[PDB]
Design a protein around this ligand. Structure first.
Ligand SMILES: Nc1ncnc2c1ncn2[C@@H]1O[C@H](COP(=O)(O)OP(=O)(O)OP(=O)(O)O)[C@@H](O)[C@H]1O
Ligand SMILES: Nc1ncnc2c1ncn2[C@@H]1O[C@H](COP(=O)(O)OP(=O)(O)OP(=O)(O)O)[C@@H](O)[C@H]1O
Ligand SMILES: [Mg+2]
Ligand SMILES: [Mg+2]
Lengths: 413, 50, 111, 223, 411
């Protein structure tokens, strides 16, 4: 009692039910999708640009003064120099993508400005040094040494003023008053790392005093020190710490040092593939070239796993400044920050809100202020009410965070 | 046998993959272990090779 | 529609070009006389459906009596859009601005 | 010839073409009028057999500057018979005229074929409302650019005021110095001040109740 | 200046499908015979108009002397290179594909304004000089990940999810169609949205339905597309994918199952996990790149949320977290309404009975019941479907997972 379908039994299904419009509606839909294809290969519009110039100015350029750049001009490569020798060159040079070579200089130069760690012009066949070139100054530093005013007010990161007061004492007081250090007989600290929960004010307290420095400031991408090519990131961190120590009163901000970090004084450090090239070179140039400097460097990360005790050996890094949560008055200050710049009611109170935000960051406090506005968009409103924020705190904190089972309450009132 | 032995004595052809490339008698080929090349066609084939 | 949104002259889509003068240093570089054709439409298009204007047509009234004969016809033609769908007092608005005895003024106004 | 077609608008009898075209049997610069009263009687329906003679007779021909007005006006009559099958052919109309016209055409496309979008709908939706600054932010200044700045002007031929101010005020900022203010400083602000005409009173689009015409067309189509 | 570089000179290429989504009889009716034959008429004519376009062009060109000689002044097998830095004295420093760096000249017809570090150029073989700059063209890997066809049906296809549909439409469609509301209060729109829940709930449906009804460029990336093995190919594609998303539209980037590319960041020194982790880090960086994102919306979707890196989940990066639960006994009525619409339903069935006896079957469970009950009618040789086919479909499909309950223990 299962039966399967014979060939005549197939024809019962396939016939019954609109046998006038079945294929009539179907092959029209079938060949139109064929026709969607047949337009597309028929169109095939795609064309090139290839970046030419208008022929008003290049026709005389396209004369023999292209061949004068073809055959007289050359195709010389660039490299780096390890070192030199005395009274005779015997220079040691890496292509580093090809091999390392022991070469000579060509006759067109003087042996003075062929110093170590320099870009030079290298012959294709005889590999002689043709022209010494600059280290490509300066997009390797000044493109992150922006020297530009950021749009962060001092009143934006209010509520954590004592952690600011730690950082205001460490950074500002030697850079503008190294006089009471002489009047008392002390020297300033020169190492501070930042760690703690994400979205706490790390980049804010960095950028607020980067706004209040009137001076050189450098922000450093953590993945920028990670490179594709082996032996390339160390060469970069060479060029950063050299040309930042040149001018005075500058700040460098390391950020997300998880990729370049890890305890190298402790059990691990079994790495050594282009991460340690960056790492061993920076800890080389962090001390050694810094007794009694002028440029302070700050690190910041979300993971306190990657603390190096060799960094925390004094001379490199001294102080563990971490950030915390606001008690209440810090939070009520922050709610006033993220709600003064939007269409609100003049009668809401914010101390009721920070009661409902026990363990929360200003990232979450900002998220509530945006979410409460989103409830005002749901209805036709243009100003927020009290209950707009009250639904937002319920939507943010009492939904995904560490409190559930609200109806079974009945033990506490 | 002479026709074989002469075509044997010949440096072989490369192979490069094109999913798509631009028109106007020149296409854009990355080959196997290398970069991309703007090349020219032969005249026994079309520009409709894509 | 005076209830829902509108007092008699918004006149400020022109004023919404306020932030441009700080975009790139300074402003006050545009003095083209053919822009003054478009200056009729800050009064022109917004005053449809009873945007009646005594002395808010003074930007018209000066430029009507300043130059631009085809703009004399145009600013006179804008008054019909100011009193649109009207039979009650529409011609009385024209008659005070009608008798200037000019070709371009009356041919714009009576159109 | 336009008031002729306005005197014979809206009937697919094809006697009015037998009337008018056999009446003005004449030289081809007067047979520019052949396409007018033909399709002015053809306001809106499905008569796709007319739409292929609206293409196949004067399609391209490369036409070194003799009848280039006629292929524009033949395209002008393609704009209607498209604005009321109720979006059945409006998707097909924007599919054709975006492709084989401005993205595959000449004096037909890059001078005139944007007046479809100033005539097909004027509600505004970001498919075609962003398809026009594809050919406007690229002004293509090599031509007498007020052809493309004519397509600037009635790009803002869409009523019911919107957020399109972002497109217009930014193009007015690049339209002050460049896109010189001798010619179109009226025009950009004519376009700018037209979307917010009043707050209200934007229904000029020949569709009442659900789909009937209410002409209407006789006042719009002259411009 | 005020309008420096006029913002990259760049247009957007949106979708080309949704040719006519009005087939609204949805049945064997002469309207759909009339509707589709209209669509056949406009596509045949657009074929024949472009067929006459490449036909009636008598041009027979002769190239200009300047253009013809420069095409012979350049090499015939031109090679693609990469700018690194620029010296304006008509010779600069570029890089090959292998990274060999050359002090080559640049010819004086290259339109010397497009030279920015990172732009792609064309090179010679003899002196390797910069023949001409290439426009910003990308690899074929990312061009596959750009959607051509609007896939499937609109919001009427899904069986009642409207609490969450109204969420995503506020975050994606409303800021594009109508960004007047946000400037009325000075509130920036949300940036990233994560869709999570038990599987078979409709996470992929809502991605397809948004990609149906949109004017944005919709990018389809699925998880382990993005992982390769040439030591830099991982973090290279993220930069290329979001460059494409930046230069094109206010855009939607849908990355699916990001749990395969993100979990809690361990850093074993072996060179297998780093390529994951370096790519994992830079995506989170390129997310908050903040240079000019230009309204690029990111939609992410997994099943489990607990095994995620908390650096992704935090606000500042991703603002919306959306649960898709096993719904109710109410929207089930709509899914059984939808998935039984195109079939000859017999008048003996009470589909409420199936919703009544059960509590935790999903939308993919319902669609499997609707197909299996139709197969049972073919077994006993029918077209209409009795109540008994749904009884046998419910028993056959469901009993494969249900294990573990304390019966008798409770009451
Ligand atoms: N203490 C605070 N005071 C004021 N605003 C805050 C505070 N903490 C967070 N915010 C809000 O959060 C954002 C700052 O987050 P922050 O830059 O500290 O993240 P982060 O520490 O860089 O995160 P991660 O370490 O994961 O990169 C600001 O936009 C601000 O609106
Ligand atoms: N609420 C619903 N309404 C209608 N159909 C649904 C619904 N939920 C699921 N389906 C059906 O289930 C199928 C699969 O759903 P979908 O894959 O989008 O769920 P998912 O959460 O993405 O599952 P996964 O994460 O395992 O891919 C869809 O093709 C759809 O037909
Ligand atoms: Mg940060
Ligand atoms: Mg899925």
């Amino acid at each position: 009692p299962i039966r399967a379908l014979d060939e005549g039994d197939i024809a019962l299904l396939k016939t019954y039910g609109q046998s006038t419009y079945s294929r009539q509606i179907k092959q029209v839909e079938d060949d139109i999708q064929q026709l969607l294809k047949k337009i597309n290969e028929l169109t095939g519009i795609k064309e090139s640009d290839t970046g030419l110039a208008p022929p008003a100015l290049w026709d005389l350029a396209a004369d023999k003064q292209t061949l004068q750049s073809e055959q007289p001009l050359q195709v010389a490569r660039c490299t780096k120099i390890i070192n030199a020798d005395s009274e005779d060159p015997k220079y040691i040079i890496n292509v580093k993508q090809f091999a390392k070579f022991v070469v000579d200089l060509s006759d067109q130069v003087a042996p003075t400005d062929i110093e170590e760690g320099m870009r030079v012009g290298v012959d294709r066949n005889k590999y002689q040094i043709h022209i010494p070139l600059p280290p490509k100054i300066d997009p390797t530093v000044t493109m992150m040494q922006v020297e530009e005013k950021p749009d962060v007010t001092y009143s934006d990161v209010g509520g954590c003023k004592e952690q600011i007061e730690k950082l205001r004492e460490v950074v500002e007081t030697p850079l503008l008053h190294p006089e009471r250090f002489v009047n008392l007989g002390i020297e300033p600290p020169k190492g501070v790392l930042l760690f703690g929960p994400p979205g706490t004010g790390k980049t804010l307290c960095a950028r607020a005093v980067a706004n209040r420095t009137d001076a050189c400031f450098i922000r450093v991408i953590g993945s920028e020190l990670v490179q594709k090519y082996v032996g390339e990131g160390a060469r970069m961190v060479r060029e950063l710490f050299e040309m930042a120590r040149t001018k005075k009163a500058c700040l460098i901000f390391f950020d997300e040092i998880d990729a370049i970090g890890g305890a190298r004084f402790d059990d691990g450090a079994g790495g050594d593939n282009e991460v340690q090239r960056t790492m061993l070179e920076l800890i080389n140039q962090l001390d050694g070239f810094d007794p009694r400097g002028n440029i302070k460097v700050l690190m910041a990360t979300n993971r306190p796993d990657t603390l190096d005790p060799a960094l925390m050996r004094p001379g490199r890094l001294d102080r563990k400044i971490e950030f915390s949560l606001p008690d209440l008055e810090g939070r009520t200050h922050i709610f006033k920050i993220h709600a003064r710049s939007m269409s609100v009611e003049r009668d809401i109170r914010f101390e009721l809100l920070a009661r409902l935000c026990p363990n929360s960051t200003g990232a979450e406090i900002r998220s509530v202020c945006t979410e409460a506005g989103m409830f005002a968009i749901r209805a036709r409103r243009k100003i927020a009410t009290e209950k707009d924020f009250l639904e937002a705190v319920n939507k943010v904190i009492k939904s995904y965070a560490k409190f559930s089972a609200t109806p079974r309450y009945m033990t506490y009132n | 046998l002479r026709e074989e032995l002469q075509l044997l004595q010949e440096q072989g052809s490369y192979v490069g993959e094109v999913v798509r490339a631009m028109d106007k008698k020149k296409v854009l080929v990355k080959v196997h272990p290398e970069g991309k090349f703007v090349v020219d066609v032969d005249k026994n084939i079309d520009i409709n090779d894509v | 529609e005076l209830d829902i949104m509108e007092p008699k002259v918004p006149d400020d889509i022109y004023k919404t070009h306020l932030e441009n003068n700080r975009f790139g240093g300074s402003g006050s570089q545009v003095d083209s006389a053919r822009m003054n054709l478009a200056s009729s439409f800050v009064n022109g298009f917004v005053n449809a459906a009873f945007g009646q204007d005594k002395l808010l047509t003074d930007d018209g009234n000066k430029w009507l009596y300043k130059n631009k004969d085809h703009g004399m016809l145009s600013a006179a033609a804008s008054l019909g859009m100011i009193l649109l769908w009207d039979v009650d007092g529409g011609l009385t608005q024209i008659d005070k601005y009608l008798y200037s005895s000019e070709d371009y003024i009356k041919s714009g106004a009576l159109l | 010839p336009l008031g002729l077609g306005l005197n014979h608008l809206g009937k697919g009898e094809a006697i009015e073409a037998i009337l008018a075209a056999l009446e003005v049997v004449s030289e081809p610069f007067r047979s520019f009028a052949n396409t007018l009263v033909d399709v002015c009687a053809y306001a809106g329906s499905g008569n796709v057999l007319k739409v292929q003679q609206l293409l196949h007779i004067c399609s391209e021909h490369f036409d070194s500057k003799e009848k280039e007005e006629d292929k524009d006006k033949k395209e002008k009559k393609d704009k209607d018979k498209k604005e009321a099958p109720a979006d059945m052919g409006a998707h097909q109309g924007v599919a054709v005229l975006g492709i084989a016209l401005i993205a595959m055409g000449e004096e037909i496309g890059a001078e005139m074929a944007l007046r479809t979008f100033g005539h097909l709908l004027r509600y505004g939706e970001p498919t075609l409302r962003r398809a026009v600054p594809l050919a406007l932010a690229l002004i293509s200044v090599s031509n007498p650019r007020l052809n493309i700045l004519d397509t600037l002007s009635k790009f803002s031929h869409d009523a019911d005021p919107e957020v399109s101010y972002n497109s217009i005020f930014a193009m007015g900022m690049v339209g002050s110095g460049t896109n010189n203010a001798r010619l179109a400083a009226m025009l950009r602000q004519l376009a700018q001040y037209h979307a917010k005409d009043p707050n209200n009173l934007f229904m000029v689009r020949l569709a009442q109740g659900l789909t009937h015409l209410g002409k209407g067309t006789l006042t719009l189509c002259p411009y | 200046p005020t309008r420096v570089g006029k913002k990259k000179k760049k247009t957007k290429g949106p979708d080309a499908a949704s040719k006519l989504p009005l087939v609204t009889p949805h049945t064997q009716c002469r309207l759909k015979l009339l509707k589709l034959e209209r669509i056949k008429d406009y596509l045949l004519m657009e074929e024949e108009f472009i067929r006459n376009q490449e036909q009636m062009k008598p041009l027979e060109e002769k190239q200009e002397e300047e253009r013809s000689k420069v095409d012979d002044l350049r090499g015939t097998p031109m090679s693609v290179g990469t700018l690194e830095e620029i010296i304006d004295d008509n010779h600069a420093i570029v890089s090959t594909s292998v990274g060999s760096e050359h002090y080559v000249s640049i010819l004086s017809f290259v339109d010397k304004d497009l030279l920015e570090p990172g732009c792609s150029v064309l090179l010679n073989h003899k002196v390797h000089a910069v023949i001409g700059v290439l426009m910003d063209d990308t690899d074929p890997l990312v061009t596959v990940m750009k959607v051509e066809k609007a896939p499937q049906e609109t919001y009427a296809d899904i069986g009642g999810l409207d609490n969450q549909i109204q969420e995503i439409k506020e975050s994606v469609e409303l800021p594009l169609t109508h960004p007047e509301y946000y400037e009325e209060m000075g509130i920036k729109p949300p940036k990233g949205v994560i869709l999570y829940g038990p599987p078979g709930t409709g996470k992929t449906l809502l991605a397809k339905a948004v990609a149906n009804q949109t004017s944005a460029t919709f990018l389809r990336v699925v998880g382990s597309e993005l992982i390769q093995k040439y030591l830099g190919d991982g973090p290279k594609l993220v930069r290329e994918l979001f460059r494409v998303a930046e230069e094109h539209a206010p855009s939607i980037v849908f990355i699916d199952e990001i749990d395969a590319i993100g979990t809690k960041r361990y850093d074993s020194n072996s060179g297998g996990e780093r390529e994951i982790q370096r790519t994992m880090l830079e995506l989170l960086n390129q997310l908050d790149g903040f240079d000019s994102r230009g309204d690029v919306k990111v939609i992410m979707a997994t099943n489990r949320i607990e095994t995620l890196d908390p650096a992704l989940i935090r606000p500042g990066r991703i603002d919306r977290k959306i649960e898709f639960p096993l719904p109710d006994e109410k929207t089930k009525k709509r899914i059984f309404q939808i998935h039984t619409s195109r079939m000859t339903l017999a008048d003996d069935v009470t589909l409420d009975d199936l919703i009544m006896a059960k509590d935790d079957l999903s939308g993919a469970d319902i669609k499997a019941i609707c197909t299996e009950a139709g197969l049972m009618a073919l077994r006993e040789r029918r077209m209409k479907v009795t109540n008994e086919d749904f009884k046998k479909s419910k028993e056959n499909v469901l009993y494969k997972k249900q294990e573990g309950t304390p019966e008798g223990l409770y009451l």
